[PDB]
Symmetry: C2
Subunit: 125 residues, 2 copies
Amino acid sequence: SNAMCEIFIRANQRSYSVQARSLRLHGVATSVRLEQLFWDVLEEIAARDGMRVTQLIERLYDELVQYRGEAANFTSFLRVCCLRYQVLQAEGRIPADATVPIRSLDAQAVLRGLPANLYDSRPLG
Amino acid sequence: SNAMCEIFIRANQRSYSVQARSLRLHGVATSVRLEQLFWDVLEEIAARDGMRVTQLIERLYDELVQYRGEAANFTSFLRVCCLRYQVLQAEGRIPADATVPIRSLDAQAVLRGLPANLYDSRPLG
């Protein structure tokens, strides 16, 4: 009944259906159930740096285990990967352009001065 | 091990913890379970238009029922609302300025020519 309703209600219906995909994480079969739009965004992220989505996810798992000791709430973490990717693009911290690989960026520049709910200040090893 | 790992692995840990809130959906108190960053984003969306987050969600529910006949997958829908809000800010279709009401916008301009996974073509009533 207003522009806000119009913009939000008119999501593509399939974009918020949930799809299960199988992945091998630290060698073990695992279930990741994500809303389709989140799979779509993870596929975009992977493509940006010339990776298959499954390889991007396996690498994220590997690194999350090293950073936190384990990879708890991994599906929720992937959701937040998608959301943060778009926040960072909206803020112009990551260029909103597919040809610039994320691996070419300066992560301390990308993350510096963000609100505290948007990142962990502890650097990766 | 690279800038992409650094950016993604270093999410705020609480941002992807799930926190339940109780919402009144067509008269029924219902527990909605969302990762903290989604709650944060829904609160910003509500604030842009001078709404309390609970009223935003209730109005969304009301309008989704009217549009689709029911509000199936409602928690998934709310996650996709947050993701699309950020996608549209990244695309420059919604101003990335949290003081400009979404209701200020021309929804037709916002949605025009988007990727097909980002919207439904049928206009609201």
